[PDB]
Symmetry: C2
Subunit: 125 residues, 2 copies
Protein backbone atom coordinates (compact mmCIF):
# COMPACT_ATOMS: atom_id res chain seq x y z
CA UNK A 1 0.00 0.00 0.00
CA UNK A 2 1.26 3.46 -0.99
CA UNK A 3 3.87 4.19 1.68
CA UNK A 4 4.59 7.72 2.93
CA UNK A 5 8.06 7.38 1.43
CA UNK A 6 6.80 6.56 -2.08
CA UNK A 7 4.21 9.31 -2.06
CA UNK A 8 6.74 11.83 -0.74
CA UNK A 9 9.24 10.76 -3.41
CA UNK A 10 6.58 11.27 -6.07
CA UNK A 11 6.00 14.78 -4.77
CA UNK A 12 9.74 15.55 -4.98
CA UNK A 13 9.95 14.12 -8.47
CA UNK A 14 7.00 16.32 -9.43
CA UNK A 15 8.65 19.42 -7.99
CA UNK A 16 12.00 18.56 -9.61
CA UNK A 17 10.32 17.97 -12.99
CA UNK A 18 8.54 21.33 -12.88
CA UNK A 19 11.89 22.95 -12.05
CA UNK A 20 13.56 21.17 -14.94
CA UNK A 21 10.86 21.99 -17.49
CA UNK A 22 10.66 18.19 -17.72
CA UNK A 23 7.29 17.45 -19.36
CA UNK A 24 7.70 13.67 -19.87
CA UNK A 25 8.79 13.59 -16.24
CA UNK A 26 5.60 15.26 -15.06
CA UNK A 27 3.27 13.13 -17.18
CA UNK A 28 4.96 9.85 -16.20
CA UNK A 29 3.84 10.32 -12.58
CA UNK A 30 0.14 10.34 -13.53
CA UNK A 31 -2.17 7.43 -14.21
CA UNK A 32 -3.23 7.26 -17.85
CA UNK A 33 -6.77 7.89 -16.60
CA UNK A 34 -5.71 10.59 -14.09
CA UNK A 35 -7.48 13.88 -13.46
CA UNK A 36 -6.00 17.35 -12.90
CA UNK A 37 -8.02 20.25 -11.48
CA UNK A 38 -5.91 23.38 -11.17
CA UNK A 39 -7.17 25.60 -9.80
CA UNK A 40 -9.80 24.01 -7.58
CA UNK A 41 -13.17 25.07 -8.97
CA UNK A 42 -12.25 24.85 -12.66
CA UNK A 43 -13.10 22.01 -15.07
CA UNK A 44 -10.72 19.11 -14.49
CA UNK A 45 -8.50 17.68 -17.23
CA UNK A 46 -9.02 13.95 -17.87
CA UNK A 47 -6.49 11.74 -19.64
CA UNK A 48 -2.80 11.70 -20.50
CA UNK A 49 -3.39 13.98 -23.49
CA UNK A 50 -5.19 16.72 -21.58
CA UNK A 51 -2.77 16.62 -18.66
CA UNK A 52 0.24 16.83 -20.95
CA UNK A 53 -1.40 19.81 -22.63
CA UNK A 54 -2.01 21.44 -19.24
CA UNK A 55 1.56 21.11 -18.04
CA UNK A 56 3.02 22.21 -21.36
CA UNK A 57 0.83 25.32 -21.27
CA UNK A 58 2.02 25.87 -17.68
CA UNK A 59 5.71 25.76 -18.60
CA UNK A 60 5.63 28.78 -20.92
CA UNK A 61 7.74 30.74 -18.43
CA UNK A 62 10.73 29.30 -16.53
CA UNK A 63 9.43 28.05 -13.17
CA UNK A 64 11.34 28.00 -9.87
CA UNK A 65 9.51 25.51 -7.63
CA UNK A 66 10.18 24.31 -4.07
CA UNK A 67 8.41 22.44 -1.27
CA UNK A 68 8.00 24.89 1.62
CA UNK A 69 7.01 22.38 4.32
CA UNK A 70 7.14 18.67 5.01
CA UNK A 71 4.96 16.41 2.88
CA UNK A 72 1.73 15.09 4.37
CA UNK A 73 0.88 11.54 3.29
CA UNK A 74 -1.63 8.97 4.51
CA UNK A 75 -4.06 6.34 3.20
CA UNK A 76 -3.02 6.68 -0.45
CA UNK A 77 -3.16 10.49 -0.33
CA UNK A 78 -0.67 13.32 -0.09
CA UNK A 79 -0.74 17.07 0.44
CA UNK A 80 2.13 19.51 0.14
CA UNK A 81 2.73 23.23 0.52
CA UNK A 82 4.99 24.82 -2.06
CA UNK A 83 5.89 27.84 -4.16
CA UNK A 84 5.92 28.48 -7.89
CA UNK A 85 8.10 31.49 -8.72
CA UNK A 86 8.55 33.19 -12.11
CA UNK A 87 9.05 36.50 -13.92
CA UNK A 88 5.97 38.30 -15.22
CA UNK A 89 6.25 41.81 -16.67
CA UNK A 90 9.74 42.24 -15.25
CA UNK A 91 8.44 41.34 -11.78
CA UNK A 92 9.32 38.24 -9.74
CA UNK A 93 5.99 36.57 -9.02
CA UNK A 94 5.30 33.81 -6.51
CA UNK A 95 2.23 31.57 -6.42
CA UNK A 96 1.88 29.54 -3.19
CA UNK A 97 -0.71 26.81 -3.40
CA UNK A 98 -1.39 23.52 -1.70
CA UNK A 99 -1.61 20.46 -3.91
CA UNK A 100 -3.37 17.17 -3.25
CA UNK A 101 -2.56 13.78 -4.81
CA UNK A 102 -4.69 10.62 -4.87
CA UNK A 103 -2.49 7.58 -5.68
CA UNK A 104 -3.75 4.28 -7.11
CA UNK A 105 -2.64 0.75 -6.31
CA UNK A 106 -0.04 0.99 -9.07
CA UNK A 107 1.46 3.91 -7.17
CA UNK A 108 0.57 6.59 -9.70
CA UNK A 109 -1.23 9.87 -9.16
CA UNK A 110 -4.84 9.38 -10.27
CA UNK A 111 -6.04 12.81 -9.13
CA UNK A 112 -4.34 16.13 -8.50
CA UNK A 113 -6.09 19.18 -7.10
CA UNK A 114 -4.38 22.57 -6.86
CA UNK A 115 -6.00 24.91 -4.35
CA UNK A 116 -4.80 28.49 -4.74
CA UNK A 117 -6.42 31.88 -5.31
CA UNK A 118 -5.72 35.60 -5.66
CA UNK A 119 -4.61 35.96 -2.01
CA UNK A 120 -1.99 33.35 -2.87
CA UNK A 121 -0.43 35.41 -5.64
CA UNK A 122 2.52 37.53 -4.52
CA UNK A 123 5.05 39.63 -6.41
CA UNK A 124 8.26 41.51 -5.66
CA UNK A 125 7.08 44.90 -6.91
CA UNK B 1 -21.34 32.01 -2.44
CA UNK B 2 -18.01 32.11 -0.62
CA UNK B 3 -15.36 34.80 -0.77
CA UNK B 4 -11.75 33.85 0.00
CA UNK B 5 -11.96 36.43 2.81
CA UNK B 6 -14.89 34.63 4.43
CA UNK B 7 -13.32 31.19 4.10
CA UNK B 8 -10.06 32.47 5.58
CA UNK B 9 -12.01 34.13 8.41
CA UNK B 10 -13.63 30.78 9.18
CA UNK B 11 -10.25 29.02 9.06
CA UNK B 12 -8.93 31.44 11.67
CA UNK B 13 -12.03 31.25 13.89
CA UNK B 14 -11.53 27.47 13.79
CA UNK B 15 -7.95 27.72 15.03
CA UNK B 16 -8.85 30.35 17.62
CA UNK B 17 -11.68 28.14 18.90
CA UNK B 18 -9.33 25.19 19.30
CA UNK B 19 -6.85 27.38 21.22
CA UNK B 20 -9.68 28.79 23.31
CA UNK B 21 -11.20 25.36 23.87
CA UNK B 22 -14.45 26.70 22.46
CA UNK B 23 -16.38 23.56 21.49
CA UNK B 24 -19.57 25.50 20.73
CA UNK B 25 -17.75 27.95 18.47
CA UNK B 26 -16.07 25.09 16.66
CA UNK B 27 -19.31 23.21 15.99
CA UNK B 28 -21.09 26.42 14.92
CA UNK B 29 -18.72 26.63 11.95
CA UNK B 30 -20.03 23.37 10.50
CA UNK B 31 -23.34 22.71 8.73
CA UNK B 32 -25.82 20.32 10.35
CA UNK B 33 -25.09 17.88 7.52
CA UNK B 34 -21.30 18.30 7.57
CA UNK B 35 -18.68 15.55 7.75
CA UNK B 36 -15.27 15.38 9.44
CA UNK B 37 -12.59 12.92 8.30
CA UNK B 38 -9.65 13.16 10.70
CA UNK B 39 -7.33 11.76 9.80
CA UNK B 40 -7.77 11.08 6.09
CA UNK B 41 -8.47 7.41 5.44
CA UNK B 42 -10.50 7.12 8.64
CA UNK B 43 -14.25 6.67 9.02
CA UNK B 44 -15.72 10.17 8.47
CA UNK B 45 -18.02 11.48 11.19
CA UNK B 46 -21.30 12.86 9.89
CA UNK B 47 -23.70 15.23 11.64
CA UNK B 48 -23.63 17.84 14.40
CA UNK B 49 -23.68 15.28 17.22
CA UNK B 50 -20.95 13.10 15.73
CA UNK B 51 -18.91 16.23 15.06
CA UNK B 52 -19.42 17.63 18.58
CA UNK B 53 -18.31 14.33 20.11
CA UNK B 54 -15.20 14.50 17.95
CA UNK B 55 -13.98 17.93 19.04
CA UNK B 56 -15.19 17.18 22.55
CA UNK B 57 -12.67 14.35 22.75
CA UNK B 58 -9.97 16.39 20.98
CA UNK B 59 -10.10 19.03 23.70
CA UNK B 60 -9.29 16.60 26.52
CA UNK B 61 -5.83 18.19 26.67
CA UNK B 62 -5.19 21.90 26.15
CA UNK B 63 -4.10 22.39 22.53
CA UNK B 64 -1.74 24.98 21.08
CA UNK B 65 -2.79 25.45 17.45
CA UNK B 66 -1.10 27.74 14.97
CA UNK B 67 -1.33 28.49 11.27
CA UNK B 68 2.14 28.16 9.73
CA UNK B 69 1.38 29.58 6.30
CA UNK B 70 -1.09 31.75 4.46
CA UNK B 71 -4.52 30.19 3.98
CA UNK B 72 -5.36 28.97 0.48
CA UNK B 73 -8.90 29.76 -0.56
CA UNK B 74 -10.89 29.58 -3.78
CA UNK B 75 -14.16 28.26 -5.26
CA UNK B 76 -15.98 27.29 -2.05
CA UNK B 77 -12.81 25.60 -0.82
CA UNK B 78 -9.91 26.19 1.55
CA UNK B 79 -6.81 24.37 2.78
CA UNK B 80 -4.38 25.41 5.51
CA UNK B 81 -1.03 24.37 7.00
CA UNK B 82 -0.73 24.35 10.77
CA UNK B 83 0.49 22.52 13.85
CA UNK B 84 -1.17 21.00 16.89
CA UNK B 85 1.03 20.85 19.99
CA UNK B 86 0.06 19.10 23.20
CA UNK B 87 1.40 17.06 26.10
CA UNK B 88 0.57 13.83 27.93
CA UNK B 89 2.39 11.47 30.31
CA UNK B 90 5.25 13.95 30.36
CA UNK B 91 6.14 14.28 26.69
CA UNK B 92 5.62 17.18 24.26
CA UNK B 93 4.23 16.32 20.83
CA UNK B 94 3.63 18.29 17.64
CA UNK B 95 1.47 17.14 14.74
CA UNK B 96 1.65 19.16 11.52
CA UNK B 97 -1.23 18.34 9.17
CA UNK B 98 -2.95 20.04 6.26
CA UNK B 99 -6.70 20.55 6.54
CA UNK B 100 -9.22 20.95 3.76
CA UNK B 101 -12.49 22.89 4.10
CA UNK B 102 -15.46 22.62 1.73
CA UNK B 103 -18.18 25.25 2.29
CA UNK B 104 -21.90 25.24 1.42
CA UNK B 105 -23.92 28.13 0.00
CA UNK B 106 -24.69 29.56 3.44
CA UNK B 107 -20.98 29.99 4.15
CA UNK B 108 -20.83 26.97 6.45
CA UNK B 109 -18.32 24.11 6.31
CA UNK B 110 -19.97 20.95 5.00
CA UNK B 111 -16.75 18.93 4.98
CA UNK B 112 -13.36 18.93 6.70
CA UNK B 113 -10.46 16.58 6.05
CA UNK B 114 -7.21 16.47 7.99
CA UNK B 115 -4.32 14.90 6.10
CA UNK B 116 -1.45 13.81 8.35
CA UNK B 117 0.50 10.60 8.84
CA UNK B 118 3.24 9.14 11.03
CA UNK B 119 5.82 11.38 9.40
CA UNK B 120 3.80 14.40 10.48
CA UNK B 121 3.98 13.53 14.18
CA UNK B 122 7.07 14.90 15.93
CA UNK B 123 7.56 13.68 19.53
CA UNK B 124 9.78 15.23 22.17
CA UNK B 125 9.33 18.59 20.45
Amino acid sequence: MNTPEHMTAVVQRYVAALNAGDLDGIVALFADDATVEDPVGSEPRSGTAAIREFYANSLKLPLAVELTQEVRAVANEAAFAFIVSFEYQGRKTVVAPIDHFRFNGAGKVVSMRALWGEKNIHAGA
